[PDB]
């Protein structure tokens, strides 16, 4: 058996909502220390990696490793089915045909029990060894989201350019071009609005706006986004959870 | 592709 | 003549909005004691019965029985045409070509007069004799709405199962199955959230989700919905007005 | 050079949003005394005239007359790109390839610079000599908007009929007909809700609902709308700015 | 049988007076 | 057209 209870049901929906577009069939691998999940999209340029630690649940039991594969389209149909104030519990038996999602209300009344049929999928889980990156930055999700959404309107490619104490996003297309230049700053009133930057080397990478427009959906999980770039290597966009993360590894464009 | 590039 | 003045124009729009989908052409039958209306859908499994009493209007006159048939698509185009604070008055002559809807504002200014052409329709008005039912419940419209909307996503059928101190809604389909179990409770803080249940016999009926998805649109009239079920007989879903009701009689899916 | 700074970036977006549907390619003509713009739609029944005076900007410089033509579809893609609290500055050189839109935040941080490529367009700017009109009215934009939106549902034509102390909007169609009669009135509590009317002669004009449904998008600019009608002539629907206006000259139906 | 049929299945044998 | 009518 697996019994994992999220304190708020909403969290699981938001988690799935960051992946849900950009990758439809995914294997969730539960074990003693939490659940992890990985998937690559059909064009093989974007890898999504999920890690929910035990500390993110209010109760968690997993007596034996269990892989449960689900269609996320199906799963998110069932996750418009509890209030953002019910508890959600995932329940699975040994070698399961199906996953149970149990939504329960605080006043002992209104149980919603859903049984979702599972799927058979090819489990290429990758031990991703932390690379070192030429640059690291973190900024508000919403700000990053707005930058990407705005520049997308000018082209299918967005170029991220890092120099010392300067981050520059640029898009260039048929109607014209645009650039957003933001500078590191720490505001003590609310340090969630801070923009931070660690640069070893300058970097200059270009990415598909199609992919950035799916990545920015991680904003449902976190106030902030971490972006790690290097010129050799795929970029990491990371959204932190309470004891976990959702990561997106995106291949740059050769131009 | 991405699997590969990461593996390095 | 007919002169019927609603205190608030909004009421008539909400009334029509509970029927508007699920049945397009309907005969409204006015007489001394208020207006009644009936319609059956094309598949003949759902009958909609409306009753607005005299007490629901602020002024009402009907010297002679009068049937006025209208296309509800047409009528709801004209009922986005007054503020929720204007008065609406229905005016019709003897044997009418047309119904007049007169929206008037409190400050003696802004008259909007609409003349809607009437239709000829076949008036099988049914004296519906009150059945006795195996069970009666009432619950919030919104809650009922959410249940139906959620389960509809899993199947074309929703099964309603009543036992003592338990109401259970179940749907079963290709991706999985779902069930929502709610229990009677009276919360005196807000008694509009209450769930009430009166059971003589257990019942176990199945209904088309297509029809439940139209019935739940009565939520525009009432905070609450009354559901009367029996195993012999069509189910009654009722939404109450100030001195009237909108009822839906639905045939179960016998299996 | 041209340097024109709006205090709030939102204002320029709202301005463009009143024109944006109903006319896509437009020449903005900057000069010493502000920017003016004109356009006629593809069916040639509607002329849109814009005038932003110098007083509408917080800073304005225009050393030399400059025409800059832009596709409004393009331009409004770039004007979902600043907050309603940034400053927007238009920057152009002499004989420009391009217009620069510079969005800057109050705290000296977040610059967004956009460079929009310009377009070549045929500049039939019309000196419109003030006509005299048989009637003038002003009413709330929202009220006018609701009238138009409501009657549009009954027909493709809406008839505006003015008599002494009475304004009557009528549409007549297949499902039925409808009329809204409003009377001039001044409510002292909030005089923004007032309806004012000056009638020299009665008028009776009919207009295409398609065009009225685009005109009412000027409501993004002003609480009120001025409507000037005469029986000889195209109607003027005008939405006032802080030191400017957006006007719609609409041909009646016959 | 329609829904009307089902509604009227007892009052069909009653005379409507 | 409309330019004409305005110019009258």
Short mmCIF file of C-alpha atoms in Angstrom, two decimals, chain A residues 4-252:
data_model
loop_
_atom_site.label_atom_id
_atom_site.label_comp_id
_atom_site.label_asym_id
_atom_site.label_seq_id
_atom_site.Cartn_x
_atom_site.Cartn_y
_atom_site.Cartn_z
CA UNK A 4 -0.11 9.81 0.93
CA UNK A 5 -2.23 12.65 2.28
CA UNK A 6 -1.69 16.20 1.02
CA UNK A 7 -2.81 18.81 3.59
CA UNK A 8 -4.52 20.81 0.81
CA UNK A 9 -5.81 19.08 -2.34
CA UNK A 10 -5.05 22.16 -4.33
CA UNK A 11 -1.31 21.48 -4.10
CA UNK A 12 -1.50 18.32 -6.12
CA UNK A 13 -3.59 20.06 -8.82
CA UNK A 14 -1.06 22.91 -9.07
CA UNK A 15 1.77 20.47 -9.29
CA UNK A 16 0.12 18.59 -12.17
CA UNK A 17 -0.87 21.86 -13.82
CA UNK A 18 2.86 22.80 -14.25
CA UNK A 19 3.51 19.63 -16.26
CA UNK A 20 0.01 19.01 -17.72
CA UNK A 21 0.53 20.64 -21.15
CA UNK A 22 3.94 19.86 -22.71
CA UNK A 23 3.70 16.15 -21.55
CA UNK A 24 0.66 13.89 -21.33
CA UNK A 25 1.74 10.35 -20.18
CA UNK A 26 4.02 10.15 -17.14
CA UNK A 27 5.22 7.59 -14.58
CA UNK A 28 5.04 8.57 -10.92
CA UNK A 29 7.47 6.51 -8.91
CA UNK A 30 6.63 6.30 -5.18
CA UNK A 31 8.98 5.00 -2.52
CA UNK A 32 9.90 5.35 1.18
CA UNK A 33 11.25 8.92 0.78
CA UNK A 34 8.51 10.57 -1.37
CA UNK A 35 7.39 10.53 -4.99
CA UNK A 36 9.46 11.41 -8.04
CA UNK A 37 8.35 11.71 -11.67
CA UNK A 38 9.98 12.23 -15.08
CA UNK A 39 8.95 12.73 -18.65
CA UNK A 40 10.28 14.01 -21.89
CA UNK A 41 8.05 15.67 -24.45
CA UNK A 42 7.46 14.26 -27.95
CA UNK A 43 10.10 16.49 -29.64
CA UNK A 44 12.71 15.36 -27.10
CA UNK A 45 13.94 18.91 -26.20
CA UNK A 46 12.35 19.30 -22.75
CA UNK A 47 12.60 17.02 -19.74
CA UNK A 48 10.35 17.58 -16.79
CA UNK A 49 11.51 16.24 -13.42
CA UNK A 50 9.37 16.23 -10.28
CA UNK A 51 10.32 15.54 -6.68
CA UNK A 52 7.86 15.69 -3.81
CA UNK A 53 9.57 14.88 -0.52
CA UNK A 54 7.87 13.30 2.46
CA UNK A 55 7.81 16.66 4.25
CA UNK A 56 5.28 18.01 1.64
CA UNK A 57 2.58 15.58 2.74
CA UNK A 58 0.92 15.66 6.17
CA UNK A 59 0.89 11.84 6.23
CA UNK A 60 2.90 9.50 4.00
CA UNK A 61 3.32 5.75 3.87
CA UNK A 62 4.99 3.64 1.16
CA UNK A 63 5.82 0.10 2.30
CA UNK A 64 7.30 -0.93 -1.08
CA UNK A 65 8.45 0.93 -4.20
CA UNK A 66 5.49 1.49 -6.55
CA UNK A 67 5.36 3.01 -10.02
CA UNK A 68 2.01 4.41 -11.04
CA UNK A 69 1.66 5.74 -14.57
CA UNK A 70 -1.17 8.06 -15.48
CA UNK A 71 -2.58 10.08 -18.31
CA UNK A 72 -2.41 13.64 -16.96
CA UNK A 73 -5.44 14.71 -19.02
CA UNK A 74 -7.49 12.10 -17.15
CA UNK A 75 -5.87 12.94 -13.84
CA UNK A 76 -6.55 16.66 -14.06
CA UNK A 77 -10.27 15.92 -14.92
CA UNK A 78 -10.43 14.28 -11.53
CA UNK A 79 -8.53 17.19 -9.96
CA UNK A 80 -11.23 19.68 -10.51
CA UNK A 81 -13.27 17.44 -8.02
CA UNK A 82 -12.35 18.59 -4.49
CA UNK A 83 -12.27 22.03 -2.92
CA UNK A 84 -8.90 23.74 -2.43
CA UNK A 85 -9.72 23.17 1.34
CA UNK A 86 -10.32 19.33 1.33
CA UNK A 87 -7.55 16.84 1.98
CA UNK A 88 -6.43 14.64 -0.87
CA UNK A 89 -5.12 11.16 -0.25
CA UNK A 90 -3.52 8.90 -2.86
CA UNK A 91 -4.10 5.20 -2.17
CA UNK A 92 -2.66 2.34 -4.17
CA UNK A 93 -2.33 -1.40 -3.50
CA UNK A 94 0.57 -3.67 -4.41
CA UNK A 95 1.01 -4.06 -8.23
CA UNK A 96 -1.95 -1.77 -9.00
CA UNK A 97 -4.49 -1.72 -11.78
CA UNK A 98 -5.52 1.66 -10.26
CA UNK A 99 -4.84 4.67 -8.11
CA UNK A 100 -7.48 5.95 -5.63
CA UNK A 101 -7.84 9.69 -4.97
CA UNK A 102 -9.80 10.32 -1.82
CA UNK A 103 -11.02 13.89 -1.14
CA UNK A 104 -12.29 14.37 2.36
CA UNK A 105 -13.80 17.48 4.01
CA UNK A 106 -12.76 18.77 7.46
CA UNK A 107 -16.29 18.34 8.91
CA UNK A 108 -16.55 14.44 8.65
CA UNK A 109 -18.98 14.48 5.75
CA UNK A 110 -18.54 14.67 1.94
CA UNK A 111 -16.15 11.96 0.84
CA UNK A 112 -15.37 12.01 -2.84
CA UNK A 113 -13.56 8.83 -3.90
CA UNK A 114 -12.15 8.59 -7.41
CA UNK A 115 -10.54 5.53 -8.92
CA UNK A 116 -8.37 6.32 -11.89
CA UNK A 117 -7.19 3.46 -14.15
CA UNK A 118 -3.38 3.39 -14.54
CA UNK A 119 -1.31 2.97 -17.67
CA UNK A 120 1.71 1.00 -18.78
CA UNK A 121 4.62 3.29 -19.70
CA UNK A 122 8.42 3.01 -20.39
CA UNK A 123 10.32 4.10 -17.26
CA UNK A 124 13.53 5.72 -18.39
CA UNK A 125 14.16 7.44 -15.00
CA UNK A 126 17.44 9.40 -15.24
CA UNK A 127 19.71 10.03 -12.28
CA UNK A 128 20.51 13.62 -13.23
CA UNK A 129 23.84 14.57 -11.63
CA UNK A 130 23.79 18.29 -10.69
CA UNK A 131 25.77 20.09 -13.30
CA UNK A 132 27.68 23.29 -12.52
CA UNK A 133 26.35 26.20 -14.54
CA UNK A 134 27.89 29.40 -15.86
CA UNK A 135 25.06 31.47 -14.30
CA UNK A 136 22.30 31.23 -11.78
CA UNK A 137 19.47 33.65 -11.23
CA UNK A 138 16.24 33.70 -9.36
CA UNK A 139 13.34 36.07 -9.87
CA UNK A 140 9.61 36.23 -9.28
CA UNK A 141 7.62 33.70 -11.28
CA UNK A 142 5.09 36.27 -12.22
CA UNK A 143 7.75 38.58 -13.56
CA UNK A 144 9.43 35.91 -15.58
CA UNK A 145 6.01 34.84 -16.78
CA UNK A 146 5.16 38.33 -17.99
CA UNK A 147 8.49 38.76 -19.76
CA UNK A 148 8.06 35.48 -21.64
CA UNK A 149 4.40 36.09 -22.46
CA UNK A 150 5.21 39.61 -23.72
CA UNK A 151 8.20 38.75 -25.88
CA UNK A 152 6.48 35.69 -27.32
CA UNK A 153 4.28 38.05 -29.21
CA UNK A 154 7.26 39.31 -31.21
CA UNK A 155 8.95 35.99 -32.08
CA UNK A 156 9.16 32.23 -31.67
CA UNK A 157 12.61 32.61 -30.06
CA UNK A 158 13.69 34.40 -26.93
CA UNK A 159 17.30 35.06 -26.20
CA UNK A 160 18.60 35.23 -22.63
CA UNK A 161 21.83 37.16 -22.21
CA UNK A 162 23.68 37.44 -18.94
CA UNK A 163 26.50 39.80 -18.09
CA UNK A 164 27.78 41.10 -14.79
CA UNK A 165 24.91 42.66 -12.77
CA UNK A 166 22.58 42.54 -15.90
CA UNK A 167 20.01 40.10 -17.22
CA UNK A 168 18.63 40.80 -20.70
CA UNK A 169 15.74 39.02 -22.45
CA UNK A 170 15.40 39.70 -26.20
CA UNK A 171 13.02 38.68 -28.99
CA UNK A 172 13.23 39.71 -32.58
CA UNK A 173 10.67 39.24 -35.30
CA UNK A 174 8.71 40.51 -38.22
CA UNK A 175 6.69 43.28 -36.58
CA UNK A 176 9.70 44.53 -34.62
CA UNK A 177 11.87 43.55 -31.66
CA UNK A 178 11.90 43.96 -27.94
CA UNK A 179 14.07 43.58 -24.94
CA UNK A 180 13.57 43.50 -21.22
CA UNK A 181 16.62 44.41 -19.14
CA UNK A 182 16.36 43.71 -15.38
CA UNK A 183 18.93 44.30 -12.74
CA UNK A 184 19.61 42.43 -9.47
CA UNK A 185 18.14 44.08 -6.40
CA UNK A 186 17.15 43.09 -2.87
CA UNK A 187 14.12 44.80 -1.32
CA UNK A 188 14.02 44.12 2.42
CA UNK A 189 10.24 44.88 2.82
CA UNK A 190 9.46 41.75 0.77
CA UNK A 191 12.49 39.74 -0.33
CA UNK A 192 10.27 37.48 -2.45
CA UNK A 193 10.35 40.34 -5.05
CA UNK A 194 14.19 40.14 -5.15
CA UNK A 195 16.17 39.42 -8.23
CA UNK A 196 19.43 37.58 -7.52
CA UNK A 197 22.32 36.67 -9.85
CA UNK A 198 25.51 34.60 -9.60
CA UNK A 199 27.65 34.80 -12.75
CA UNK A 200 30.89 32.90 -13.38
CA UNK A 201 30.83 33.37 -17.15
CA UNK A 202 28.61 35.44 -19.41
CA UNK A 203 25.99 33.39 -21.21
CA UNK A 204 23.97 33.95 -24.35
CA UNK A 205 21.36 31.29 -25.16
CA UNK A 206 18.26 31.21 -27.30
CA UNK A 207 15.17 29.17 -26.55
CA UNK A 208 11.86 28.35 -28.24
CA UNK A 209 9.04 30.49 -26.96
CA UNK A 210 6.70 27.46 -27.31
CA UNK A 211 8.68 25.75 -24.57
CA UNK A 212 9.14 28.74 -22.34
CA UNK A 213 5.31 29.28 -22.49
CA UNK A 214 4.80 25.85 -20.95
CA UNK A 215 7.60 26.21 -18.43
CA UNK A 216 6.17 29.37 -17.01
CA UNK A 217 3.16 27.34 -15.90
CA UNK A 218 5.25 26.29 -12.89
CA UNK A 219 4.19 29.64 -11.50
CA UNK A 220 1.22 27.91 -9.95
CA UNK A 221 3.69 26.27 -7.50
CA UNK A 222 6.11 28.93 -6.47
CA UNK A 223 6.50 32.69 -6.01
CA UNK A 224 9.94 32.36 -7.44
CA UNK A 225 11.71 30.61 -10.33
CA UNK A 226 15.34 29.54 -10.47
CA UNK A 227 17.08 29.65 -13.82
CA UNK A 228 20.45 28.01 -14.30
CA UNK A 229 22.14 28.54 -17.65
CA UNK A 230 25.32 27.45 -19.29
CA UNK A 231 26.62 27.68 -22.86
CA UNK A 232 27.42 23.99 -23.15
CA UNK A 233 24.22 22.70 -21.78
CA UNK A 234 20.50 22.54 -21.34
CA UNK A 235 19.01 25.18 -19.14
CA UNK A 236 17.32 24.34 -15.83
CA UNK A 237 14.14 26.16 -14.84
CA UNK A 238 13.17 25.18 -11.33
CA UNK A 239 10.14 25.95 -9.15
CA UNK A 240 10.51 25.00 -5.51
CA UNK A 241 7.83 23.25 -3.46
CA UNK A 242 7.53 22.79 0.29
CA UNK A 243 10.16 20.03 0.39
CA UNK A 244 10.46 19.40 -3.34
CA UNK A 245 10.76 20.78 -6.80
CA UNK A 246 9.51 20.80 -10.31
CA UNK A 247 12.31 21.15 -12.83
CA UNK A 248 12.40 21.75 -16.52
CA UNK A 249 15.53 20.97 -18.48
CA UNK A 250 15.36 22.76 -21.80
CA UNK A 251 17.68 22.40 -24.77
CA UNK A 252 18.84 25.62 -26.39
#
